[PDB]
Design a protein around this ligand. Structure first.
Ligand SMILES: O=C(O)C1=C[C@H](O)[C@@H](OS(=O)(=O)O)[C@H](O[C@H]2[C@H](O)[C@@H](NS(=O)(=O)O)[C@@H](O)O[C@@H]2COS(=O)(=O)O)O1
Ligand SMILES: [Ca+2]
Ligand SMILES: [Ca+2]
Length: 841
C-alpha cells in the first residue's frame, strides 16, 4: 500500500524521456509525440543575465509510427526541425510502435529504441485540423487577427452601445497631439545606478524600462482598438506616431529584457493588422521590418528549447502568444511566417495549455494571472479560423475548479508561488478569465463564480489589476457568445478538491459562503521548488472568512535575491518541517507528491510525501543562478547533506467543523533535531503549555483565529521570533526599505531517529468559540470526534479518527490495514467505504 520513490527528480527542467511514455495507454487520440533534443538545451538562465549558454545547432528529426513493428505496413512518417509531432488523425485501436530519429548534417539517421503505446475504445479523441486546412481557408484581407474584416461592421455596430468599448476612445483621445518623449527622458534610472550586483542592477533596469514601455503599449493598443471601433483616422495617425517613437527606443542601452522586445512585436502586429489598409509604403515597411526582425529572434530562441523546457515562463505568459499573432498576421506575406505558424500551431497542440493536466497552475497564485490572455486569446483565435473548438481540451474545465478553489470569492489566495502574499481578493482579470471559461466551455461553476462575485461587487471587472497580460475587454467586445445563465451555486461544490498532478489540496467548510469559510490549503508537489514555486512541500496554510491566519511568511522582493532564497522560497518560511534547521533543495529535486487522498462530505483527507525533498542543492539551473546572484547554498544558509529517510504529512478535514488534524511520520538516517514550524503575518502567536503538549494561538487583525494543539512523540522546546533569516529589503524600489516583519514559531524536539507529531488545528472566527480539546481515556476527543494515534518513536505509525454521531471515520495503520488508509463517510444518506493506497503522479 505504501510506495517508495527513489528518483533524483520527478520532473525535468529539460526533457529527458519520450512522450507518450513506453508501454503506456495514451490519454488522448491522436497522441502528442515529444522527445528529448539531440542536444538538450537549457538556454539562458535569467532574463537580464544569460549566464553560460551552449551552442544550439539547427537540427532535423524524423518519426515513424505503425501498428506493424517492422514499420512496413500503414506507417505514419514525419520530418520536423523540432522534437514534437502531431499526426492530425485519430489512430486505430490496439498496440502501436514508434521511434524518432536525429538526422546528422551528413544525412545519417540515429534512430531511437522502438517505443510502444496503446489506444483503447475508451481513449478520448481531441483531433484539431491540419495547419494546411486552416491556412487554405485563411483570408488574405486585413484585419484578420484582431478581428476579421467580414465581421468588422457588425462588431462596430454591436459596440456602439457597449460602455466597455467607450474606454478605448477615452484613453486614446487623451494621447492625441500629446507628444511622447524619448526613453532616456521618461525612464527613471536613479535606483538602477545604485546597484552593484549585476543580477539586481539588470533586473531593476528591466523593471524601470518596462514601466515606460508598458504604459505606452496600453496607449498604442487603445489607439488601434479605438480605430477599429470608430474608423476615425485620428486614432490611426496618433497610433502610428506613438508606435514609431517607441520602436525608435529599440537600440537604447535602456531597452532591456525580452518582454520589452516582445512588446514591440505585439504593437507592430496590432498596428499592421488594424491599420493595414491605411499604411503608407514607409509605414508598412517599418512595421514589417520589425515583425521580421523580432519574430525571427523569438522563433530562434524557442526552437529546440521551449518545447522541452519544463515551462518557459516569459514565453508561456506572453511571448508565445505574441509570436503566434505576428505569424498569423503575416503568413503568406513574409516567408519567415510560414515557419513561425508551423511551429506555434503545432507547439500549442503538442502540449498547451498548462503543465499540470489536472488544471492546477504550476507557478502559483499570482503568476496564473500573467497567463490569462494567452490561455484565452490563443484558443479563441485558433477556434475561429479553424472551425474547431480548441476549448474541448479537458484542461479548461479542470482549470475552472482551480480558479475557484485556489481563491474563493472575496478571499485570500491559497498561498502558493512567488508573490502569493499580495493576492488578497479575486481581481478583475481573474473574473474576466472565469467569464471567458463560462462562455467558451459552458462551465456552470465558472458561471457561478462570476455571477456570485458580481452580485456582491458589480464593478469588479473595472477594478485594479495588471492589464497587460490579463485584460479580456477586447475579447468581450468581439465574442458573439453570451454569459450562460446562472445555474449551479458555489455552495453545491465539494468541500475539498485535490489536484494530484499539481500536488495541491484545498479544504473548505463553507466555500459557497466565503465569510463563514474555514479553509486549509496544502502542497506536496512533483514540480518541487523551481521557477516561481516555493520550497514548501508538506506545508499548509489556514484561513477564515477569506483572510489568512497560519501562513507562509516572507516577502517576494525578487527572483534570486538573498531574502527570496533564505527567507521566502526557503522551507524555513513555511508551515512545514526542518531537519537540524535544514530545508528543502531548490529546484525540481526538492519534490513532494500526494500518494493518496479522499474528497468527501463528513470527512476529507490528503497525504503529502516529502521524503526526498531535502539535502544539498544540485540543480544545475539553480546552481548557475546562485553563482550569478551571490547565493550560498551552504549549511549556514539552510542546506546540508540529507538526513531525511521519510516524511509523510496526513491532513484530515473534520467535516465542516473548522477542525483539521495534521499527523506527521518522520524518520531520519541518524538521530536529528526536528523543527516544527508555524508562521503568522499580522500579529505574534501566543504560546502556552497545554496538557502534554503546546497550544499555539494564531490570529489576524480581523475576526480570524487558528489554534494549533501540538503534540509529539518526543519532548519539545519552542521559541518565537519576529525576525527574518535576512531582511526583506525592497531593493527594486527607489530608496526601498525593509518590508514588514512576520512571526515565526519553531518547536524543536530532542534528537531522535524517528518522531511523530499530532496537530489538531481549530480554525474559526466570530462564528463560534474555541473548540475544547479533551484528553480522556488515553485518547483525545473534540466535538464528538475521537482521535487516536501513535506518538511513540519506537512504535508503528497509526491514526484513527471517528465521529460516531456523523458516521465518519479514518483508519491509517501498518497492521491490519497493511499501510492503507480506510475511510467511512456519509454521502447523501449513504454509507461510503473506501480503502486508500498509494499511487504515483
Ligand atoms: O513574468 C515573470 O515570470 C517574471 C517577471 C520578471 O521578469 C521576473 O521577476 S522579478 O521581478 O522578481 O525579477 C521573473 O522573470 C524570470 C523568469 O520567470 C524566468 N523564466 S524561467 O527560466 O522559465 O524560470 C527567467 O527568465 O528569469 C527571469 C528573471 O530574470 S532577471 O530579471 O534577470 O533576474 O518573473
Ligand atoms: Ca507562469
Ligand atoms: Ca508554491
Amino acid at each position: 500500500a505504501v510506495i517508495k520513490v527513489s528518483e533524483e527528480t520527478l520532473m525535468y527542467e529539460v526533457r529527458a524521456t519520450p512522450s507518450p511514455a513506453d508501454g503506456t495507454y495514451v490519454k488522448v487520440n491522436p497522441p502528442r509525440f515529444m522527445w528529448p533534443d539531440k542536444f538538450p538545451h537549457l538556454g539562458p538562465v535569467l532574463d537580464g543575465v544569460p549566464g553560460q549558454v551552449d551552442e544550439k545547432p539547427k537540427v532535423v528529426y524524423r518519426i515513424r509510427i505503425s501498428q506493424d513493428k517492422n514499420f512496413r505496413k500503414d506507417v505514419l512518417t514525419g520530418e520536423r526541425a523540432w522534437a514534437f509531432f502531431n499526426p492530425f488523425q485519430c489512430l486505430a485501436q490496439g498496440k502501436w510502435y514508434w521511434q524518432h530519429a536525429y538526422v546528422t548534417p551528413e544525412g545519417t539517421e540515429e534512430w531511437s529504441p522502438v517505443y510502444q503505446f496503446y489506444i483503447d475504445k475508451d481513449t478520448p479523441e481531441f483531433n484539431p485540423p491540419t495547419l494546411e486546412k486552416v491556412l487554405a481557408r485563411y483570408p488574405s484581407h486585413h484585419p484578420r487577427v484582431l478581428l476579421d474584416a467580414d465581421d468588422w461592421e457588425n462588431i462596430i455596430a454591436k459596440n456602439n452601445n457597449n460602455p466597455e468599448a467607450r474606454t478605448y476612445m477615452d484613453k486614446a483621445s487623451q494621447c492625441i497631439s500629446r507628444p511622447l518623449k524619448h526613453l532616456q527622458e521618461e525612464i527613471d534610472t536613479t535606483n538602477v545606478v545604485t546597484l552593484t550586483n549585476i543580477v539586481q542592477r539588470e533586473s531593476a533596469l528591466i523593471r524601470e524600462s518596462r514601466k515606460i514601455v508598458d504604459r505606452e503599449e496600453a496607449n498604442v493598443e487603445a489607439l488601434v482598438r479605438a480605430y477599429l471601433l470608430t474608423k476615425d483616422e485620428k486614432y490611426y495617425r496618433e497610433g502610428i506616431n506613438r508606435l514609431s517613437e517607441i520602436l525608435s527606443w529599440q537600440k537604447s542601452k535602456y531597452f532591456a529584457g525580452d518582454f520589452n522586445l516582445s512588446t514591440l512585436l505585439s504593437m507592430s502586429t496590432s498596428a499592421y493588422d488594424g491599420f493595414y489598409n491605411l499604411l503608407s509604403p514607409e509605414e508598412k515597411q517599418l512595421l514589417l521590418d520589425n515583425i521580421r526582425k523580432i519574430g525571427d529572434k523569438f522563433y530562434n530562441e524557442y526552437v529546440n528549447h521551449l518545447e522541452n523546457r519544463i515551462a518557459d515562463n516569459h514565453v508561456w505568459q506572453m511571448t508565445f502568444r505574441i509570436l503566434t499573432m505576428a505569424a498569423f498576421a503575416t503568413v503568406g506575406e513574409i516567408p519567415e511566417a510560414s515557419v513561425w505558424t508551423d511551429y506555434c500551431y503545432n507547439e500549442w497542440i503538442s502540449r498547451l495549455p498548462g503543465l499540470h493536466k489536472d488544471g492546477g497552475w504550476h507557478n502559483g497564485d499570482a503568476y496564473f494571472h500573467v497567463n490569462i490572455r494567452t490561455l484565452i486569446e490563443v484558443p479563441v483565435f485558433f477556434s475561429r479560423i479553424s472551425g474547431f473548438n480548441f476549448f474541448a481540451d479537458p484542461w479548461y474545465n479542470n482549470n475552472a475548479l482551480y480558479v475557484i478553489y485556489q481563491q474563493p470569492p472575496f478571499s485570500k489566495s491559497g498561498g502558493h508561488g512567488n508573490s502569493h502574499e499580495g493576492q488578497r481578493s479575486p481581481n478583475g482579470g481573474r473574473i474576466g478569465y472565469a467569464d471567458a471559461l463560462a462562455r467558451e466551455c459552458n462551465n456552470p461553476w465558472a458561471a457561478a463564480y462570476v455571477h456570485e462575485i458580481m452580485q456582491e461587487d458589480p464593478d469588479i471587472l473595472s477594478k485594479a489589476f495588471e492589464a497587460k497580460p490579463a485584460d479580456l475587454t477586447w475579447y468581450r467586445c468581439t465574442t458573439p457568445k453570451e454569459r450562460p445563465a446562472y445555474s449551479k451555486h458555489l455552495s453545491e461544490l465539494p468541500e475539498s478538491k485535490v489536484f494530484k498532478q499539481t500536488g495541491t489540496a484545498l479544504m473548505n467548510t463553507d466555500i459557497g459562503h466565503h465569510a463563514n469559510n474555514a479553509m486549509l490549503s496544502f502542497r506536496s508537489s512533483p514540480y518541487g521548488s523551481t521557477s516561481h514555486a516555493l520550497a514548501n512541500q508538506n506545508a499548509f496554510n489556514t484561513f477564515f472568512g477569506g483572510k489568512a491566519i497560519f501562513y507562509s511568511s516572507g516577502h517576494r522582493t525578487g527572483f534570486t535575491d538573498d531574502h527570496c532564497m533564505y527567507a521566502y522560497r526557503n522551507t524555513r518560511a513555511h508551515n512545514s518541517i526542518l531537519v537540524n534547521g535544514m530545508g528543502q533543495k531548490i529546484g525540481t529535486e526538492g519534490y513532494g507528491w500526494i500518494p493518496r487522498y479522499y474528497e468527501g462530505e463528513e470527512i476529507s483527507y490528503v497525504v503529502g510525501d516529502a521524503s526526498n525533498a531535502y539535502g544539498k542543492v544540485v540543480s544545475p539551473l539553480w546552481l548557475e543562478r546562485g553563482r550569478l546572484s551571490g547565493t550560498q547554498f551552504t549549511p549556514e544558509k539552510g542546506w546540508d547533506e540529507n538526513k531525511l529517510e521519510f516524511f509523510r504529512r496526513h491532513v484530515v478535514q473534520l467535516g465542516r467543523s473548522g477542525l483539521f488534524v495534521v499527523y506527521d511520520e518522520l524518520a531520519g538516517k541518524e538521530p536529528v533535531e526536528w523543527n516544527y514550524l508555524l508562521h503568522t503575518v499580522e500579529l505574534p502567536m501566543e504560546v502556552v503549555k497545554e496538557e502534554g503538549g503546546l497550544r499555539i494561538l494564531g490570529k489576524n487583525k480581523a475576526d480570524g483565529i487558528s489554534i494549533a494543539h501540538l503534540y509529539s512523540s518526543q519532548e519539545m522546546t519552542y521559541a518565537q521570533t519576529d525576525t527574518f533569516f535576512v531582511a526583506a529589503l525592497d531593493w527594486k524600489k527607489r530608496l526601498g526599505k525593509a518590508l514588514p516583519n512576520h512571526y515565526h514559531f519553531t518547536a524543536t524536539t530532542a534528537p531522535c531517529n524517528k518522531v511523530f507529531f499530532l496537530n489538531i488545528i481549530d480554525v474559526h472566527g466570530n462564528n463560534r468559540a474555541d473548540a475544547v480539546i479533551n484528553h480522556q481515556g488515553n485518547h483525545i476527543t473534540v466535538e464528538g470526534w475521537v482521535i487516536e494515534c501513535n506518538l511513540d518513536s519506537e512504535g508503528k505509525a497509526f491514526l484513527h479518527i471517528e465521529n460516531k454521531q456523523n458516521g465518519a471515520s479514518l483508519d491509517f495503520n501498518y497492521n491490519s490495514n497493511k499501510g492503507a488508509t480506510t475511510i467511512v463517510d456519509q454521502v447523501d444518506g449513504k454509507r461510503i467505504e473506501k480503502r486508500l493506497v498509494d499511487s504515483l503522479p
